[PDB]
Amino acid sequence: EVLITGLRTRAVNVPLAYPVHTAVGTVGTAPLVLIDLATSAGVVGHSYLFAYTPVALKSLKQLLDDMAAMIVNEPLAPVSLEAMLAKRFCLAGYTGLIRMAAAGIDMAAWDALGKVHETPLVKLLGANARPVQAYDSHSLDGVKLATERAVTAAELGFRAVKTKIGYPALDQDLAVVRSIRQAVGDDFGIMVDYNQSLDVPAAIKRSQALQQEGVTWIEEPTLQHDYEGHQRIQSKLNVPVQMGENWLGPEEMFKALSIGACRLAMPDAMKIGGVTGWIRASALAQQFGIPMSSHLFQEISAHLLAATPTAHWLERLDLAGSVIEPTLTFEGGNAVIPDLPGVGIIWREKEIGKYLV
Amino acid sequence: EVLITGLRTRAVNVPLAYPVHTAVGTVGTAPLVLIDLATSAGVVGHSYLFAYTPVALKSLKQLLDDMAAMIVNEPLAPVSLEAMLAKRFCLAGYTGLIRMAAAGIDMAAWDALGKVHETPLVKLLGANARPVQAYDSHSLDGVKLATERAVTAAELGFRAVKTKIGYPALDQDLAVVRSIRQAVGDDFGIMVDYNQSLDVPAAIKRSQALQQEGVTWIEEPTLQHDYEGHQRIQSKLNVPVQMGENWLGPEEMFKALSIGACRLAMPDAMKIGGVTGWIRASALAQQFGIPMSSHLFQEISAHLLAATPTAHWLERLDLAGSVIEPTLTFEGGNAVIPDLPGVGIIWREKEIGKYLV
Amino acid sequence: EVLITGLRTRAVNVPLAYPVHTAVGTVGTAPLVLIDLATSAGVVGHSYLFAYTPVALKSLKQLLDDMAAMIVNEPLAPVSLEAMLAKRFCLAGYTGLIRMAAAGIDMAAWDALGKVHETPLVKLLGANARPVQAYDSHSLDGVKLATERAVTAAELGFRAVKTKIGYPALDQDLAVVRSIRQAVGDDFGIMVDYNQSLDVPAAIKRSQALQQEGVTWIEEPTLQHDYEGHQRIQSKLNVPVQMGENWLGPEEMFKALSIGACRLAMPDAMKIGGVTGWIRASALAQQFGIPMSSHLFQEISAHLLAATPTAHWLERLDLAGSVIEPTLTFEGGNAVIPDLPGVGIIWREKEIGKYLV
Amino acid sequence: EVLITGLRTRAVNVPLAYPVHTAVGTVGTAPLVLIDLATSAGVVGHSYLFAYTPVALKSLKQLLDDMAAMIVNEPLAPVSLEAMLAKRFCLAGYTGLIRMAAAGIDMAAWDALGKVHETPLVKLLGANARPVQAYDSHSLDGVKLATERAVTAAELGFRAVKTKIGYPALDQDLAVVRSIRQAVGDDFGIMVDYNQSLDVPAAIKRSQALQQEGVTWIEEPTLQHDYEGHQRIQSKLNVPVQMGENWLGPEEMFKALSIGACRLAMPDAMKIGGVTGWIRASALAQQFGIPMSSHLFQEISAHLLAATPTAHWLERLDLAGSVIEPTLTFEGGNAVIPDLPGVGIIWREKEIGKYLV
Ligand SMILES: *[B]([O])([O])C1=[C][C]=[C][C]=[C]1
Ligand SMILES: OB(O)c1ccccc1
Ligand SMILES: OB(O)c1ccccc1
Ligand SMILES: OB(O)c1ccccc1
Ligand SMILES: [Mg+2]
Ligand SMILES: [Mg+2]
Ligand SMILES: [Mg+2]
Ligand SMILES: [Mg+2]
Incomplete structure (x- = not known):
């Protein structure tokens, strides 16, 4: 009708x-x-x-x-x-x-x-709204700005940040992580993202080094489609390998989880297939025992994670803030779903x- | 609220x-x-x-x-x-x-x-109502009543029946199937259900004989929790092994599908976890490539199958007809969701x- | 008859x-x-x-x-x-x-x-009564009560205790174990029980930290039915993963052991199927090479373990003591089967x- | 340069x-x-x-x-x-x-x-030009037109045709194959293509019926990305399962061959990644022991197959003949590379x- x-x-x-x-x-x-x-x-x-x-x-x-x-x-x-x-x-x-x-x-x-x-999306999906812990997602910023943005993030109440690494030298990756760590303290999350930039042996060497420093997860160390290589990298690590933002559809997620590519998952609301694809991805993560985070699309991901049995972290990276009203808020580092129907998107x-x- | x-x-x-x-x-x-x-x-x-x-x-x-x-x-x-x-x-x-x-x-x-x-449940789940083919589900009735019930089902427009087998002799199993087939013709489904009554070697022997006779699927040939044994039975068959009515939660379905216990699945709306559990089971069946039918609970299963990507058959077995108004109808053997909010259950x-x- | x-x-x-x-x-x-x-x-x-x-x-x-x-x-x-x-x-x-x-x-x-x-149950099963080492089983008591109870158990002659952990922070888990260790010394068993409260990556992180501290086993780190996740956790540990209290029947134990979920087992006399199920579970643990403890039901478990080829520990947690005569006794931390026919249970x-x- | x-x-x-x-x-x-x-x-x-x-x-x-x-x-x-x-x-x-x-x-x-x-592309790649056997590729044409096009193809010199199937009834698939076979004789190839239209159990049932009739291969019986399902279909067949036209890059071919999805492969010159991807795909097919055919792009596929160690068939389906000069010719059913530099494409x-x- x-x-x-x-x-x-x-x-x-x-x-x-x-x-x-x-x-x-x-x-x-x-x-x-x-x-x-x-x-x-x-x-x-x-x-x-x-x-x-x-x-x-x-x-x-x-x-x-x-x-x-x-x-x-x-x-x-x-x-x-x-x-x-x-x-x-x-x-x-x-x-x-x-x-x-x-x-x-x-x-x-x-x-x-x-x-x-x-009704809000989360309620239409049969779940209650709940705050979802969020990390402030930064980039390959260099030691100076990376430490500055980390301190600002902690000042705004986030309990974790993600920096993007893969500098020419491993010692540059380590210097960035060490500088953030000294500025935020031990009780703080530092996620790192290589954006597919390492081959498998390089990923093992850098990751074991980062693991000694203390990081929260290691994201896309090698080519996104190379699930077997991600498995081999994860096999040499205690820290979780994290991936999933480049899975096009839950069928690709299923292939990766089936061979043990990663101990964490972070589907992308766009690439995974929207709400429909997200719901299927969350059923998979539940059965494979995978804590499931989001990649971008923070506005809809707040609703989606609230409905996700193994919901882990929301990625705060506000790509659309300049054209979308800021109805989504963050209290103590947690994304707070707005009391609005649907997703809560209002164009600017x-x-x-x-x-x- | x-x-x-x-x-x-x-x-x-x-x-x-x-x-x-x-x-x-x-x-x-x-x-x-x-x-x-x-x-x-x-x-x-x-x-x-x-x-x-x-x-x-x-x-x-x-x-x-x-x-x-x-x-x-x-x-x-x-x-x-x-x-x-x-x-x-x-x-x-x-x-x-x-x-x-x-x-x-x-x-x-x-x-x-x-x-x-x-709004009807199917539409709340985001899917269109569609008619879904139903088989008329019978029982361990003996040659005479099984044939009569199959004829009545064909006269009512159903395109398949299910009979329950596991008589003392395999020849009695075969006699019921043969008598039904004579009465309903070649272009008609005959599903058979052993209700866990055979050991693995007996299941292989009887199932290969039923396969020669011509049957649509072979349901629960051995103990329901023995997924490995169902896999061994399925490995000796072209006809699909069907199971699922006794999976308690999608986690048990995931274990059975992970080892290849069956080529068809039929979760029971009650044991699988209700709507919430059925939606998760539906995501598993899609990724494992398993056509998915229902067991019992025809009133809600008509809604759930319309939302199931690999929907196969609805089991028509009207356990609650004496206490629920017949708002679910069957046209040409297809279950038709009533235009009623939620599931469409009205108590008598x-x-x-x-x-x- | x-x-x-x-x-x-x-x-x-x-x-x-x-x-x-x-x-x-x-x-x-x-x-x-x-x-x-x-x-x-x-x-x-x-x-x-x-x-x-x-x-x-x-x-x-x-x-x-x-x-x-x-x-x-x-x-x-x-x-x-x-x-x-x-x-x-x-x-x-x-x-x-x-x-x-x-x-x-x-x-x-x-x-x-x-x-x-x-005749006592153990003798009817064809075995000699023998003393069975027992650990005193406590709970999520906080650092102060956990230490006091551990000292009391040592004074009573027990050579081990179990504490239940899974506090909000890992540092709280570690503080309890450290304070028990200070008070009982190095030659003393400290078992820890997570009661399914962790996801697989959190279990690996916490378990590797407890392992450095020194614990005797790590019990039910994640969801009890997730055998694969338990294997993934165990694959990262030298200390044994312990589980089994929630197996409903030996067939569930068989699934878990077949995929290597744990290096120790502890069936529950109730959930495993009673004496009949216990004897079958004991045959499985022997062939899979798994030292086998008990969970609760200390009155019958003293009999059962004395007939168990890989008998390990008895769990002392006296749930029914207020309504059952204390015919079971503990000498030097060992449960001592009473000279009574059957199990030795007399109602109060x-x-x-x-x-x- | x-x-x-x-x-x-x-x-x-x-x-x-x-x-x-x-x-x-x-x-x-x-x-x-x-x-x-x-x-x-x-x-x-x-x-x-x-x-x-x-x-x-x-x-x-x-x-x-x-x-x-x-x-x-x-x-x-x-x-x-x-x-x-x-x-x-x-x-x-x-x-x-x-x-x-x-x-x-x-x-x-x-x-x-x-x-x-x-120099012609084939010679640039280090191979001699050689005629490549080609099958005339038709579609879901119905019994009458399918048989007419097969007869015409045989008269033009082709030794094999492909028809596209997956009619509502299996009996209609069989009628087309039988009608073609009567018209072309036993010493003639009949390839059949389901274009992903079947689920796994229906693929097994239809394919075993087709194999009894006698067909040359069965192409994309189920969803193209379901390599595991294609493996299950192939496990029940003597006739080869054929796939590949939808592999995007040799990396998708590597995943499919690694799990045994098919005994034949047919990369698409476009989807596989052009010449560069084709050469990589051909190295894979050689090591996996897979006879390798082409899908579409007959102009350049004649060059590429002449350089392919396990080259099998060329698909003749002339999508661009209205805009490309007919420099590629067919003698005795074999594609003959033109004596022209590069690929031999001249725009009309x-x-x-x-x-x-
Ligand atoms: B067991 O040892 O895990 C247990 C759990 C709850 C209550 C008593 C014992
Ligand atoms: O977190 B991600 O990997 C990311 C990549 C590109 C743009 C923004 C975010
Ligand atoms: O289809 B069944 O397996 C079934 C079993 C018992 C009662 C009703 C139906
Ligand atoms: O052969 B093929 O599968 C094909 C599909 C669509 C158009 C042309 C050819
Ligand atoms: Mg990333
Ligand atoms: Mg049944
Ligand atoms: Mg316990
Ligand atoms: Mg094709």
Whole structure:
């Protein structure tokens, strides 16, 4: 009785207070596609996608706009919508940009369904809202800024930070971790992210060194698709290997967990397949005994983790803050879901125009 | 903002048009516990449990009555409720009767949540209602009654039946299947169910004979907890081994699927953990590539299968027809979800009194 | 030919001198079902069940009373009795409360059979009575009470104690172990019990820290049914992982040992299936090379371990002392089987009335 | 040093004499992106991509146009180019449409490199040109048209055809195969392609029936990413399971071969990663003992198979014949590489104009 009536997308390049430097390149602006899903019920679903590089930004918008005719006049039934897209793209390949587009549609449809029922997403999924501990996610910032941002994070009440490492020398990785540690004290989380930058022997050598220093987890040490190599790295470590942000669909998560690639998981609300894919990913993490965190998309991830049996950490990295009202808040380091229907996304319409492609 | 305000259970022994004879004993009447979950929104959630033997009926109701103190005044959030029950029973053993009672609470809570939102359960879960093929489920009836019941089922539009086998001789198993097949023709499903009655070598011998005869699946050939033995049986067969009705929680399903016990699965809405458990089981079946059917509880299973990516068959075995209004209908052998909020269970209040224990 | 003539059950809530605090809740009083099995030979068998939570207490009594008609007029043949119950409950689910109930019948039947033959249980099983080293089992008591209780146990002649841990911080776990170690010295056993309270990475981190401190075993680090997770934890440790109190039947022990979940086992006389299940569990532990301890039920466990080829420790935790004569004694920390027929259980009939439900 | 000096893309929707009907939908016209890679040597590399659905057509062209900045002024060294693209898209996801775009650049770059050296691509790779046996590839055509196209293919000299199957009834699959077989005789190949349309149990049942009829291979019986399910299907067959057209990169082929998903492989020159990926795929097939065929892209696949140690069949399915001069010929069913530099693609420039989007 509630039909999808239209799809509107806006491609933006939004500024970042701090560029996200990684060992494999810098993300200085966030290329985003903002999504509005119109319905016959007088509500509009909102979601957005992260294109990672501006090279893929216009292609992703064009893809979504050409997909509108697939979903317009279909019922607002996101699980059924997802199965339809899966089958329609089964020859072309239901992965990559195509899967990311379907995930954006999925996330806007669930927002709209929450609005239809005038209830937050987390409650529509049958769970209570709860605060979720969050770590402040930084980047490959150099010892000076990394220590400064770590101190500010602790001052704002976060109990952990993530820095991105993979400097030319191991001693540079260690100097950054040591400087943060001396500034925050022992009772504080320091996660580190290599962004796929090491080969397997280098990952073992750097990770065992970092493990001696004291870190909370070691994230994507090597190529994301190399589940076997991640298993070999994890086999040489006590500290948990963490991965999952690049899993395109829960089927990729299933392959990785099946061979023991990691003791922690952090799906990406976009790449895992939206709310629908997240729910399936959480069922897997529960059965494999994997504490499950989020990657980006903090607005919807606060709802999703509240419904996740093995919920671990929320990643605070506010890529869309310049175009989304800050209804999501942080109290004592914990993300607090807003008392709003659906996801709680309200566009900053006066700001969006500044960034349109 | 919506709280549970009461729990009421009624234990009944209800009549069956045909006793469910099995290889390991006869269920002549259905011992049920009917559950009413009152809420601060006025609506009342309805579910029921199947105790299998009257020996367990009063024990199950007593357990549920003593569990009221754990859920009354809690939010109507089934997923959070389930996590609380899992933790509170973790020393006692969150399995068996305790797990079945938690599932009954879960199913009533989801019915109530659908009622709060004035929407059928399938749509609350994000899926469209679709008709789902049902087989008419019979029992260890002997050649004559098995054939007559198969003919009546075909006349009612069903495209498959299930008979329960495990007679003293294999030739008696074969005689029933052959007689059904003569009466219904080649283009018709005949599922067979041993109800755990064989050892592994006997299962292999009888199953290969049934395979030659022509059957749709072979269900629970040996002890339900012996997943390894089911794998060995399946390794000698082309016809699929079917199991799952006795999995207590998705964790037992995960163990069976992990070792290849069966090529088909049929979780029981009660034993698998209610809606919350069924959704998790549904995610496992998709990733393991297992077509997923239901066992009993046709009223809620029609909703649940419509949301299940690998949905296969609905088992039609109407244990509670004498106390529940026939709002679930069958058109051309397909179960049709009624346009009613939540599950669509309406008590026959004047009938329930005739059967109270 | 000795027949069973009747079954009498009494549900009691008995006081504990020290509540059993665990990381997942406190057992402040012990809910027990006391069992009398009447026979045609003028002897009555005695046993009891531990319901863990009062929520299950009346349900468990009701179950046993409704099972009386299954066993009355049957031969006093516990092994044959066990097979009949397994079959009768094979549809309902021969696990959880049902399996615990059958175990209570088994344990009283073997007591009565010892009485028929005027001989202690251990001798009826073909073994010599022998002293069995026992550890004094405490709980999550805090550093001060844990140290005081450890000293008291040392003064009484015990060579080991178990404390339950899983405080909010690892440093709190370590502080308790350190303060016990200061007070008892190096030549003394300190077992620790997490009661399923940790996820797999937290278990590895905490267990590797406790291992450096010096502990005797690490019991149930994670969810009891997660055998694979227990193996992953054990794979990171030199100290043995200990589990088994929550195995419902030897078949669950067989699954856990087959995948290497633990290097020690401790079946629970109730949950493992009584004497009949214990003897089978002992055969499994011998072949898998697993030293085998007990959990609770110290009265019957002294008999059982004396017949167990890999017998390790007896757990001294006197749940039923307020209603059972102290015929079991401890000399130099060793449990000493009483020279009484059957198990040596004599009811304190004057005390039982004070705690009836 | 030769540099890339420009990249031009043209999106076309070209006509097909016969629509490619499949069990999951029909490709009635071919959406292609034609690629021109201009170089400082004057020669222009040519290649094209198949978008499968018009829904992806403009998005793929937009992506390629925005990738121009990454490759213009880079050396014409395809292997180094591919490494650079893999690194640049390692955050976005080097798969799906992005990977197909990189493959189109790779195939154009190798054609240009053959042109720089005035030599056919096969000779550039160090192999002699040799005729490659080709099967005429049809679709889900129905009994009458399937048989007519098979008869025509046999008259044109082909020794094998492929039909696409997965009709509603297995009996219809069999009728098509039987009708073809009567018309072409026993000494003739009949490949069949389910295009992922079956679940695992249905694949086993249909495939064992097909194997009794006599077919040459069974292609993509189930979901393309379900390598484990393909292994289970292959475990029940003597006839080989064939897959590969949907592997995105040789790394996906490595995962599938590592678990034994199939006894035949058929990489797609586009999805596998162009020439560079094909050569890596061919090294894998050799070591795993897998006869390796092609999927689509017949113009360059004739060159690549002549260099492939386990080369098996070439798929003749002429998607681009409306826009590419017919320099590739077929003698006695064998593809014959043209005596032209690089790949031998010459645009039909006056025809391309008719199909531009
Ligand atoms: B056991 O030793 O783990 C136990 C648990 C709860 C109460 C008593 C003993
Ligand atoms: O946490 B991540 O790996 C990340 C990568 C790129 C941009 C932002 C975050
Ligand atoms: O389908 B079954 O296995 C079943 C068993 C007992 C009663 C009813 C149905
Ligand atoms: O052979 B193939 O599977 C194919 C699929 C779609 C279009 C063309 C060819
Ligand atoms: Mg990362
Ligand atoms: Mg059955
Ligand atoms: Mg314990
Ligand atoms: Mg194909």
